[PDB]
Design a protein around this ligand. Structure first.
Ligand code: ZNF
Ligand code: NAG
Ligand code: NAG
Ligand code: NAG
Ligand code: NAG
Ligand code: NAG
Ligand code: NAG
Ligand code: NAG
Ligand code: NAG
Ligand code: NAG
Ligand code: NAG
Ligand code: CL
Length: 335
């Protein structure tokens, strides 16, 4: 093989009858999953990949952009008025497959950080059931670390680049908007479970920073979407204040940590650049049961001449959410 890139295609397990809109777009944009797909570990052939220079991330990105533009349509989009009926919405696993001529190579070593030489390399024709979850700060409904928690970064020293933390435990949030404000919402997280995981996070993160005294803090400057944990639940965008996770120390607090949320009608687009307003949340209890499997953080710019390094959660670029699950695939050209 040789390093090359070709516009791949997708594969879904969707249903042709459901009107949940992830299915709808995937049914008429992807083919059925390969019934019998097979992996083959190349006998001691070692290959090196790197996510931050992967093209399927960019290509997958373009997919969900076009998907949402087809799907989540706004009443008004300042980037034009349209129709905005409230629809069903729930992530579906999506696979990606090379066309005739190329093959995806996947890394199987449990300690891989996503940059450098993998030894246990195998060959696939399609990816795995990647769930395209759009969310900020923390990583939702993603994979799971096959060993220790892993810190993924294009360049640890460069602080303008984002840092992804892949958790080996799936700590969990439980967000709800009960019925008769119509926009009051709240997520509940087990305090000691997430804090036992984060006290591990800082200790398996200090090791990359010369045993410098690490420390966590809340976002310093932003536009809600980056400062507040923003995601989509049952078609509604949820802005949730996560100051109780990176500030409520405990590194008298082992109960259910409860964070507040608001349902924002106006949303600064994650796809292009601009605002887009919708309509009120539909009546009835709106509950989503999601898994935190990772977090996105941004280092300090300036904490050089210090004994510390404060970390703040990262947002904006949704490519890193795509990178998090695509950290193990690289498309190669068979020759
Ligand atoms: C061209 C630029 C433009 N962007 C941008 O200006 N912002 C600032 C306002 C908020 C954007 C954002 O993430 N929004 C968001 C919406 C829904 C949900 Cl559910 C979510 F989780 C997040 C990020 C996007 C960026 C990728 N791109 C580089
Ligand atoms: C390489 O990864 C595959 C996938 O699980 C599996 O055979 C095993 O973990 C590794 N193989 C060897 C020989 O260690
Ligand atoms: C996760 O990885 C950390 C290493 O930082 C380890 O201490 C911990 O026991 C691991 N947990 C699980 C459930 O594997
Ligand atoms: C990733 O692993 C490679 C090879 O083991 C190493 O050179 C590199 O420093 C690691 N990167 C991070 C961010 O740990
Ligand atoms: C990482 O960032 C530092 C500081 O900007 C720079 O000196 C270094 O060359 C970068 N690494 C790479 C591989 O470019
Ligand atoms: C959440 O995590 C648990 C344990 O890691 C797993 O069994 C479950 O399938 C996950 N849920 C989703 C929706 O991924
Ligand atoms: C999630 O929160 C709601 C509201 O507090 C609660 O009724 C539900 O039982 C919670 N989920 C679980 C699995 O306990
Ligand atoms: C940090 O301290 C631990 C002591 O538990 C030691 O094992 C490790 O080598 C130290 N690493 C650095 C980078 O100072
Ligand atoms: C989150 O709540 C804290 C109070 O606990 C508040 O100081 C902070 O401003 C809130 N976050 C945002 C983005 O307003
Ligand atoms: C995560 O998966 C669960 C289980 O299917 C689902 O209920 C929840 O809505 C998902 N979270 C998001 C943000 O889509
Ligand atoms: C200070 O930070 C810059 C980039 O933020 C980096 O290039 C430089 O090496 C740092 N200095 C020290 C002493 O770490
Ligand atoms: Cl041999």
């Amino acid at each position: 093989w040789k390093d090359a890139d070709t516009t791949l295609f997708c594969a879904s397990d969707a249903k042709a009858y459901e009107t949940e809109v992830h299915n709808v777009w995937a049914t008429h944009a992807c083919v059925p999953t390969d019934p019998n797909p097979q992996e083959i570990h190349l006998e001691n052939v070692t290959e090196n990949f790197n996510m931050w220079k992967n093209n399927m991330v960019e290509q997958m990105h373009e997919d969900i952009i076009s998907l949402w533009d087809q799907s989540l349509q706004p009443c008004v989009k300042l980037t034009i008025k349209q129709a905005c009926p409230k629809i069903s919405f729930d992530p579906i696993p999506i696979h990606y497959c090379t066309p005739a001529g190329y093959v995806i190579l996947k890394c199987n070593d449990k300690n891989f950080n996503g940059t450098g030489p993998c030894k246990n390399v195998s060959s696939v024709q399609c990816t795995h059931g990647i769930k395209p979850v759009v969310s900020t700060q923390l990583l939702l409904n993603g994979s799971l670390a096959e060993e220790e928690i892993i810190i993924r970064s294009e360049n640890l020293t460069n602080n303008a680049k984002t840092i992804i933390v892949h958790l080996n435990k799936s700590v969990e949030i439980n967000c709800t908007r009960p019925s008769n404000d119509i926009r009051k919402a709240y997520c509940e997280i087990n305090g000691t479970k997430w804090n036992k995981v984060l006290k591990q996070v800082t200790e398996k993160l200090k090791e990359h920073f010369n045993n410098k005294t690490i420390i966590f803090q809340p976002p310093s400057g932003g536009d809600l979407e980056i400062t507040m944990h923003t995601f989509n639940c049952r078609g509604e965008f949820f802005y949730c204040n996560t100051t109780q996770l990176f500030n409520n120390t405990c590194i008298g607090c082992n109960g259910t940590i409860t964070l507040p949320c608001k349902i924002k009608q106006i949303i600064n687009m994650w796809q292009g650049t601009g605002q887009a307003m919708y309509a009120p949340p539909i009546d009835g209890k709106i509950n989503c049961v999601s898994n935190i499997t990772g977090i996105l953080l941004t280092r300090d710019g300036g904490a050089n001449n210090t004994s510390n390094e404060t970390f703040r959660p990262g947002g904006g670029d949704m490519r890193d959410n795509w990178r998090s699950e695509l950290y193990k695939y690289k498309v190669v050209q068979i020759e």
